Design a protein around this ligand. Structure first.
Ligand SMILES: COc1ccc(S(=O)(=O)Nc2cccc(C(=O)Nc3cccc4nonc34)c2)cc1
Ligand SMILES: [Ca+2]
Ligand SMILES: [Ca+2]
Ligand SMILES: [Ca+2]
Ligand SMILES: [Ca+2]
Ligand SMILES: [Ca+2]
Ligand SMILES: [Ca+2]
Ligand SMILES: [Ca+2]
Ligand SMILES: [Ca+2]
Ligand SMILES: [Ca+2]
Ligand SMILES: [Ca+2]
Ligand SMILES: [Ca+2]
Ligand SMILES: [Ca+2]
Ligand SMILES: [Ca+2]
Ligand SMILES: [Ca+2]
Ligand SMILES: [Ca+2]
Ligand SMILES: [Ca+2]
Ligand SMILES: [K+]
Ligand SMILES: [K+]
Ligand SMILES: [K+]
Ligand SMILES: [K+]
Lengths: 138, 360, 138, 360, 360, 360, 138, 138
């Protein structure tokens, strides 16, 4: 497991967001910190970014969840966030599902895209989702 | 209404007298330059041509002094009309008398007709060998004749549109502003800074070069710094603070002019820096257009970089499923590079969005 | 009287405030011009400054009144405004009437002030007003 | 729709003609440099190699003049299409004819084939000894060939993305922006100022050095300032306004090039100052992070300083109660120092809080 | 109330002791200058006049040291009264003792009476020929006497109105500001920057010139850089970073003074740039009045340009209907020019309106 | 959690290897300086002392190359752990291999043991007389050893608190900030600009001076610019852009170092200007306190000026009523002066009020 | 007709305003773009500027109308806009009709203006309108 | 007592805050002065600061109380303010009472802290208060 120094530094970083010391980072405290950093996050975006690392879905970030978030944030570049952003900009319509039309459109910036769709649709639902995208990326 | 008519009739007389004083001062300076240039080689200081030219300078100086006196009389009458006085002694303070005497003294220095000489001794540069000469006294009176250029500033101030305009004066007095020559200088430097900085420095380049040549032609038997294109080289490399050294002044006058040139060059580098810094800034209408164009560019780049990320990821997956390793590793490297590029363009787009939001 | 050029320039200056061209400068137009110049005048101060040159008291400035205002504003310094400001700062209490106490207080920054009061009280009301101040100043 | 296709076809023809004119101008300049370098030592001005190279320069200049004429014809047609004229005489104003003639004159100066010579005399530096030589006339026509670099600016402006893009032109039209070369220069100086300042100066360094060497190789029997690495040393120490003096030009051409170098160095110090001042500023995303980190640091410092204050106060109390004097005084001094340090850290934390509140 | 009376009675004593210390330090420096100047030619270092003048310097230095000690005793008492201590050993830290010793050492360097000499060897400039001399030792003790000018800064700080005023002290302490000499320097540079920059540099010009002359009069048999107006020329061209070269120091002292002068000139160009940039900016009222005047000007220009557009259009129409062609094309060209001018003035007016709206 | 432990254990190893590489690089540079200084006069290049010192340099260089290789292996492992790779070939791009080879080449240039010589010819300055010598080859390998100072920047970046801190990294990641060496440089220049500018320039002064002396001691039989205090004078007057001329480099190495010094001085004047301009601005609290103090001062001045106006008006009235004229006229003049002074102070107070209102 | 590249670029420029992709630029989208450009157009001015090129009067700009607007906006200077602005500044009263009084007033900055009015009134309504102004200009 | 010049200067300093001249510094006057100085003080903080030197507790600062405040504020460093701020930052919970846990936590940046608690708890209430802290500091 992590050594004493690492866990101490990460506990300090956790308490940097956890003002009340209850052990969980509520979305309000994260929003207050973000506002103090000069940014203005909406409630919807803040909630969407707080369930990214929330494994149990309780709505708050405990210490292990924050440790996972740090373990994926300490690196200079994380493949997960870049893959998600690429998938988001792929989906022009914003419905969460990219069909063959958008793929063919973005590939122009026939057989190859057909092979991509055929080998990317693991469930065979006729369309490409986020799980299929991350499966193909890795 | 009995004061406005008089005030305008005195504004017009004051402006006309300033114009005529500038005309006669510049005529005196020009004839001084002509006579100084000619009396070196064309004829001698005992000739009748020199007597005629110096008589012309003196007759221009007498009329200039008369015009200065009449201008100050008109300004005294303006003080009377403004502050509702009745006795002219009331307008005559100590500062006003001092400035009248200063202008008269400045405008009464000119080459007096007749030949007079004084012994001039200077230490030659780079050899320190003394050189003596019997120089005329008209050269220590010709150089001060360039002090009549304050009439230029007076004419610029008096002829300015907002100094005499009724509406401009009303708006200025409504905001409690003094329309002195510093306000005119600031407005010129904010409207046309390059033109002012290019006229005021290339017109003083000729004056400094001529002064150096005139002062040093007495102690220069080589025609090195007493040649006009040589003095104009010395002054230019002094103003730009290069200071080569091959042409360094011999006499105290040349050294003083070079010191003044260096001081004004060190004061004009600041003006150049300010003007350039104010001329690189993009205006709001230009900055908005630039930001919109860069937003479009970054969106296109982001689209194509996401396309490249997915293309490389699929190629790597296909090579892995095709029981191949080397090409799979090459395409994994390409996928990592594409992900890094996508992150870079995303960060640039976010920075642009933040800048646009802060501006708007 | 004034020449054609002077009256033309002064008519242009008058129309610079007179947008509607009715021949009178309403206080609203002067306030709008003042705001366009970057200043923020209150209604009370604006009205107080518009009756300074209003000879007939009609509430607006016609052309002759504006000509008088210009004839006293063209000069570099006007004695009337400076005298009024001096009288205003003399009156610490702001009641419009300076008694001997304020005079004695400001003279320290006995017989002389008594002589000043005696020779300045033209009406003999025991106190110094603005008319007495401008009479003594001139 | 009958004008848009014509306008785009004329944009394309105009851009292609600009590209070809730049190609031929640069080819002429390069062949001029080659011939000037070779004709000094490799062969003489009467050789057939010199005739061939100067014929190549002339044949490039003829084609360049033709391309300039055709480019101006295309601009005339563009003026027709834009302003809906019918007769080409409508487009021919005085300024346009003057600029056409200026470009033709600038692009028609080149070394004419044939041997022509003129007597050149100069005053050597630091010795003032005259030197006379029979110099060729092709050196007073080779130096003006560097004026063909305005085609570089024309090509940069015509090839710029936002000059010809339909969306960029529309966005500029909504905001009433003029897409002249000053807008392009400002956008370059705000996007990549260091790259522009490093290309525009290290490309003129070689041009000025070659001009100095070419002008002064006729009056240099010591190979001091007529050597390329010597001319490139002189020009560099003139641009940076050091001006040592050991290498000062002999001829009027070298002195003029050094004067222009000094002027442009004094104008480029302003650009350097502006760029550096704009490159030290922290952006908002960096200022906020820095302020957060420094706030954390100051809170930790305050905690430890209050700890020291209480520790020293208790130590002083314990030594006072222990009937000790020397250690009591030492620890009272330490307590006063700790209180002063705590005050300092509290004040700087308050200043940081004030700054954060002001920017947020 | 038992502390305020003591604190004010000690403020007054501290200020008076600072005044007297400055008086005696300046008297010592002045007598040092007089004796150094006289002992070169008027008399020799063994004369009784030199003994009397050096005794005067020593008797001024003894009193200066006494005043410094008493000033520090008063400051110790002030520390006692401020921090409520009782034993003076509490106030004596390491930094305070170091600074007391530093001031005493700085103020105890002066020409001791008596004749002492040391062998001084220097390498002459531009010839590299060694020159040795038997120079007095009083010249390496006279130059450090210019370090007593920190008393000037101390007196300026102590005599400043806001340092001792109860009102200003209360207002500053309410905002938690330290009234050190940097605050005084910043307030001076924001109130009267030109006056400070003109006094602090022309008073150091004389000091540097005298130091160069005093150090180099031992190795100068030509009276070139050991003459006061020559040293004052060398220092001026070093400060302005011209550096001609004809007068370059021979000795290590002259070279060191010239290096310090160059450093301070490179640090004062920044101050000049900042002051000039802050003195070109138009104030709010001036900018508003200027914008109003330019708005009036642009409206008049727009009126007359629309008038010209319609006049030219009608003239062109009349000539076309009059079965004329050449005048028709002339007036069509004039109409196009008038339309372009109208567009230019309209764009300028729109830019002015945008600037005014952004400002307000 | 299986990645954080490895990442921290690799951060520590990377930092330790950077520290050791800096230690060994500085040791190699120091021994190079010692050997270069000693082998000139103390012993010759064939001595055993030179062999021992060059063996020490080589043994330090071998260990430095090993530490660089191990550092890059640790960084490869860090790339593996970060991007979840498994094969080290994936981490090896073209840029990474190029930079590894560049560092190895930079850190493998050192004086090889053994005596080797090459013929060095230079043109002496101000006389243009050629001078040849049989110089050792170890001087063209000693000068490149100063390129190992990039390890200083690497150690500064790796040891910085916010680079490795978990909380600082998290806060930077929320705001998408890259912690490269430019961010560290900007934070240093905004926290302690004077200290950085005084260490980075006085540590390079010694390096440039030593390089000039080492390069030019082979072509200097006068000990003029091959003396350390002479080279350090040359470099200082080049950096400050004075450029006297008496000491101008003879060799290409000295001229190149002087050119680089001039470039960096022209780039450091910009930093000085920016720092000074940012150090003259008054803090918000300081400006508020200054404005309050000036408000109090202006109110006091306005009170006393109105008092003087009324005093003079009454005195004039009393003298008029006393059948006196001359004193009445004197006091009318004084009254006009007092009215002008009152207007001036009123305008200053109004300007201060406007500035305060705009600020708040 | 226009080539493929020109129509593609102009379609991209059209879609730069047409966010929803319905093929018509509603006034709201143009206002949003203008606000994003830093300007603040009023609804009245925006509607007035959207019917300049609206040939059919449907209230929105289709592709051919936008092509006409580009065809008159690509040029460095358009005579139509300058003529319209000149006519606007000619009409001091703002009623859309310039009578002889304003013409005579602006010509001073007798027979000539009479000839201008006589040869400019094509319909003989006794006054000069915008259509007569553009007829005389061309 | 204080001399005449000191009394005059301190009365001027008092009248800086005493705008109405009623002889007492109402909290509103101090608030408006500190707003004119650029600060933004809350009512609670203003009241806390105004009872710092309010000896009689009437809610306003008369001349003798202002003289005490000046006699404590004219010095370069005020020991009382620094001691109070140190005690404030010692109290993490903000309840006004520092227990042994906070002291033990802040000393680590056993017997010694126990001795400190024993010799600092003058009233023997099991905790450390502000008066005990200032007694131990002095
Ligand atoms: C002082 O500001 C600087 C700007 C930029 C730089 S740099 O290292 O990027 N370039 C650089 C380096 C050395 C010498 C020269 C050089 O002499 N240039 C030129 C010669 C002649 C005419 C010129 N017109 O513009 N530059 C010209 C340029 C350094 C300092
Ligand atoms: Ca919480
Ligand atoms: Ca959870
Ligand atoms: Ca989709
Ligand atoms: Ca699916
Ligand atoms: Ca009206
Ligand atoms: Ca009326
Ligand atoms: Ca009263
Ligand atoms: Ca009365
Ligand atoms: Ca739409
Ligand atoms: Ca439509
Ligand atoms: Ca009308
Ligand atoms: Ca009609
Ligand atoms: Ca009160
Ligand atoms: Ca009370
Ligand atoms: Ca507690
Ligand atoms: Ca207790
Ligand atoms: K220089
Ligand atoms: K020089
Ligand atoms: K120089
Ligand atoms: K220089």
């Amino acid at each position: 497991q992590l050594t004493e120094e690492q866990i101490a530094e990460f506990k300090e970083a956790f308490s940097l967001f956890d003002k009340d010391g209850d052990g969980t980072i509520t979305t309000k405290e994260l929003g207050t910190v973000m506002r103090s950093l000069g940014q203005n996050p909406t409630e919807a975006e803040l909630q969407d970014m707080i369930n990214e690392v929330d494994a149990d879905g309780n709505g708050t970030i405990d210490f292990p969840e924050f440790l996972t978030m740090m373990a994926r944030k300490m690196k200079d570049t994380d493949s997960e966030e870049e893959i998600r952003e690429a998938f988001r900009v792929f989906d022009k319509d914003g419905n969460g599902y990219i069909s063959a039309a958008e793929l063919r459109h973005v590939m122009t910036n026939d057989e190859e895209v057909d092979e991509m769709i055929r080998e990317a649709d693991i469930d065979g639902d006729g369309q490409v989702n986020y799980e299929e995208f991350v499966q193909m990326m890795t | 209404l009995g004061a406005l008519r008089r005030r305008r009739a005195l504004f017009e007389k004051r402006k006309r007298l300033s114009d005529y004083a500038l005309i006669f001062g510049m005529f005196g300076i020009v004839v001084m330059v002509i006579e100084t240039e000619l009396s070196w080689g064309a004829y001698d200081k005992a000739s009748l041509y020199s007597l005629a030219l110096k008589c012309l300078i003196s007759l221009s100086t007498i009329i200039l002094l008369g015009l200065i006196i009449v201008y100050h009389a008109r300004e005294i009458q303006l003080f009377m009309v403004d502050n509702g006085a009745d006795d002219w002694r009331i307008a005559m303070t100590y500062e006003r008398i001092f400035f009248i005497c200063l202008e008269i003294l400045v405008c009464a220095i000119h080459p007096i007709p007749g030949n007079y000489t004084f012994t001039w001794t200077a230490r030659l540069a780079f050899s320190y060998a003394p050189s003596t000469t019997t120089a005329d006294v008209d050269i220590i009176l010709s150089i001060p004749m360039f002090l009549r250029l304050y009439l230029i500033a007076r004419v610029m101030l008096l002829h300015s549109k907002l100094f005499t305009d009724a509406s401009s004066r009303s708006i200025g007095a409504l905001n409690k502003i003094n329309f002195n020559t510093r306000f005119v200088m600031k407005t010129l430097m904010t409207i046309c800074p390059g033109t002012v900085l290019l006229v005021f420095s290339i017109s003083l380049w000729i004056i400094a070069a001529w002064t150096v040549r005139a002062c040093e032609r007495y102690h220069d038997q080589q025609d090195v710094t007493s040649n006009f294109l040589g003095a104009m080289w010395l002054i230019s490399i002094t103003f730009l603070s290069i200071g080569y050294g091959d042409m360094v002044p011999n006499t105290y006058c040349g050294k003083g002019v070079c010191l003044l040139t260096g001081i004004m060059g060190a004061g004009c580098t600041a003006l150049v820096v300010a003007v350039v810094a104010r001329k690189l800034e993009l205006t709001k209408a230009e900055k908005h257009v630039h930001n919109f164009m860069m937003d479009i560019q970054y969106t296109k780049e982001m689209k194509e970089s996401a396309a490249r990320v997915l293309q490389e990821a699929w190629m790597f997956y296909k090579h892995t499923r095709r029981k191949e390793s080397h090409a799979a590793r090459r395409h994994q490297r390409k996928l990592l590079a594409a992900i890094n590029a996508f992150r870079q363009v995303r960060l640039k787009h976010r920075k642009l969005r933040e800048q646009v939001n802060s501006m708007v």
